[PDB]
Amino acid sequence: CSCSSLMDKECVYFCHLDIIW
Amino acid sequence: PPCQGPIEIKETFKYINTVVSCLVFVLGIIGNSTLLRIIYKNKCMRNGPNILIASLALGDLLHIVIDIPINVYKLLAEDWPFGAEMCKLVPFIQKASVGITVLSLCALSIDRYRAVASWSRTAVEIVLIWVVSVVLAVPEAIGFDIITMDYKGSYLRICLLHPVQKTAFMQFYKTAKDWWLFSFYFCLPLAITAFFYTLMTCEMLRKRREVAKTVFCLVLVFALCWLPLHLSRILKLTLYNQNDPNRCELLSFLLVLDYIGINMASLNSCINPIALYLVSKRFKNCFKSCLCC
């Protein structure tokens, strides 16, 4: 998914668990 | 960094989602394959509006094939071992299929309006619709990329819309992907189909309730089945914060919202053959003949 940057760990972890869309 | 809570998915929801996804996948594939078989085999059924319906069916079938399996893999594995190019194409194919489906719904609504409005009663439209659908999915085909991480000890790899990108327009897409998707793949087809079907009913007033009921059911199911995913993504974009422990709960709940919404989208893909059965006598007999033998 979309994240502000690579420093926001939780957003990218959600991207890991989120659907492909 | 910690939110005062981890991120995880309940197992009950996983079981429910797996069962629902299996059932909707099977139903949609059977229905769309049967519709395509009927339209292709029967020469009398090879006609403009029927070719539009076949386009919609093929788009829905390709949409089902590419979404449910990968989401099942995500839930039951929580990994993406397919490499960068596979995740480079999957969003592209997914958005192309969604565009094909929505534009085919629009074209079919236009065709029904024409059929009911004019009594004198497609190749260019289908090619135009499909080409425009493939090109609009190009940004997904150049945008996504894989990134590595450490997270509380566990080393992870995620394929996503990497925030850092090369060009100004590519960065603009990286920033407005979800807004673009909600404003094109959902609002535009909903509005077009609803308006054209309203015109069809208005003409029937100028000149049978069952067909209007079918129209209402189709539009309502489309709305109710494509709303949840867009709602989840806009909620992410709107209520997600940072630097403070007020975001992890939202992410955990958004997992559930997104998976429910993708099941509903698959159900909308599955819906149309059922309607064309319960409404059309010709399609009813065709389904009886194909399925029962």
Author numbering:
A (entry chain L): 1 to 21
B (entry chain R): 88 to 208, 218 to 303, 318 to 403
The authors write:
The endothelin ETB receptor is a promiscuous G-protein coupled receptor that is activated by vasoactive peptide endothelins. The ETB receptor is known to be a promiscuous GPCR, capable of activating multiple types of G-proteins Inoue et al., 2019; Doi et al., 1999. Here, we report the 2.8 Å-resolution cryo-electron microscopy (cryo-EM) structure of the human ETB-Gi signaling complex bound to ET-1, revealing the unique mechanisms of receptor activation and G-protein coupling.
We refined with a mask on the receptor and obtained the receptor structure with a nominal resolution of 3.1  Å. The agonist ET-1 is well resolved. The extracellular half of the receptor superimposes well on the ET-1-bound crystal structure, and ET-1 interacts closely with the receptor in a similar manner. The ligand binding pocket is essentially similar in both the crystal structure of the receptor alone and in the Gi protein complex. However, the W3366.48 rotamer, which comprises the bottom of the ligand-binding pocket, differs, thereby leading to the activation of the intracellular side of the receptor. The downward movement of the residues is larger in the ETB-Gi complex than in the ET-1-bound crystal structure, which consequently results in the outward displacement of the intracellular portion of the transmembrane helix (TM) 6 by 6.8 Å as compared to the apo state, and by 5.1 Å as compared to the ET-1-bound crystal structure. Upon receptor activation, the ionic lock between D1983.49 and R1993.50 is broken, and R1993.50 becomes oriented towards the intracellular cavity, similar to other GPCRs Zhuang et al., 2022; Rasmussen et al., 2011; Ring et al., 2013; Cherezov et al., 2007; Manglik et al., 2012; Huang et al., 2015. In contrast, the N7.49P7.50xxY7.53 motif is altered to N7.49P7.50xxL7.53Y7.54, where Y7.53 is replaced by L3867.53. As L3867.53 is a hydrophobic residue, it cannot form a polar interaction, and hence in the ETB-Gi complex, TM7 is not displaced inwardly.
